[PDB]
């Protein structure tokens, strides 16, 4: 009940997608480092968390895509987002993955729904997957209305999996983890 409010608000935030941009990293001036992205005359500050800190050194980084979710921060920054950095596509991707949703309402009834998640990137961040999928589950399945727990599992063609626990926000460090979008096989969602 109480926890759903915060999650529903976060996962209904607006997002932005920047592709084929350049990232600019200057000397560390605070506790976390940032990649600056300037698509159209405003500077986006992307926190470098988890694996991204060692992945991007000072200087210019070409072929950068960013999945952006602006949010509040303790650094006094106006256009701040965490993770979501990937390598731009070498060429167009036109792929898709079936989503299988099992939901048990607050009355015990078990239902099923299906959707198709469209994949247009070779490399996709767990940030993007987690965010887009939860937003879809809120809009179409009322996630965080009556029920707000369970899991999203991204199943890969090689047998790998990536799990997002629905009762809390995706851990920040994992927002920088990236996977092969073309190798996503299907997605399983269980809400309870
Ligand atoms: C304090 C904190 O934020 N710690 C996180 C780890 O999360 C904690 O430990 C977990 C075991 C769990 O108890 C969680 O609730 C805690 O916050 C985090 O560990 C990942 O947690 C997620 C669930 O939130 C998964 O359990 C993940 O295991 C898997 C996965 O299913 O997603 C296993 C899977 O085999 C593996 N896939 C491959 C191909 O290797 C994936 C994958 O490594 C991750 O999804 C990539 O993000 O992991 C736990 O690893 C941990 C992940 O690095 O980060 C902080 O330490
Ligand atoms: Cl695995």
From Swiss-Prot:
tRNA processing listed as a keyword: no
GO cellular component terms attached to this protein's record: extracellular region
Localization (cell): Secreted
Start and end residues of each stretch annotated as Sialyl Lewis X-binding: 64-162
Superkingdom of source: Bacteria
Keywords: Secreted, Signal, Virulence
Predominant place of localization: secreted
Family membership: Belongs to the staphylococcal/streptococcal toxin family.
Function text: Secreted protein that plays a role in immune innate response inhibition by interfering with host TLR2-mediated pathway.
Domain remark text: The C-terminal domain contains a V-shape binding site for sialyl Lewis X.
Protein's name according to its UniProt entry: Staphylococcal superantigen-like 4
Provenance organism: Staphylococcus aureus (strain NCTC 8325 / PS 47)
Taxonomy of the source species: Bacteria, Bacillati, Bacillota, Bacilli, Bacillales
């Amino acid at each position: 009940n109480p926890k759903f409010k915060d999650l529903r608000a976060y996962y209904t935030k607006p997002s932005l997608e920047f592709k084929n941009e350049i990232g600019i990293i200057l000397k560390k001036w605070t506790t976390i480092r940032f990649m600056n992205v300037v698509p159209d005359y405003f500077i986006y500050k992307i926190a470098l968390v988890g694996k991204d800190d060692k992945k991007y050194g000072e200087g210019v980084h070409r072929n950068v895509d960013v999945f952006v979710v602006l949010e509040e921060n303790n650094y006094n920054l106006e256009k701040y987002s965490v993770g979501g950095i990937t390598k731009s596509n070498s060429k167009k991707v036109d792929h898709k993955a079936g989503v299988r949703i099992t939901k048990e309402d607050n009355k015990g009834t078990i239902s099923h729904d299906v959707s198709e998640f469209k994949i247009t990137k070779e490399q996709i961040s767990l940030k993007e997957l987690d965010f887009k999928l939860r937003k879809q589950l809120i809009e179409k399945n009322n996630l965080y209305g009556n029920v707000g727990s369970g899991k999203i599992v991204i199943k890969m063609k090689n047998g790998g999996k990536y799990t997002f626990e629905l009762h809390k926000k995706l851990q920040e460090n994992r927002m920088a983890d990236v996977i092969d979008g073309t190798n996503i096989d299907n997605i399983e969602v269980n809400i309870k």
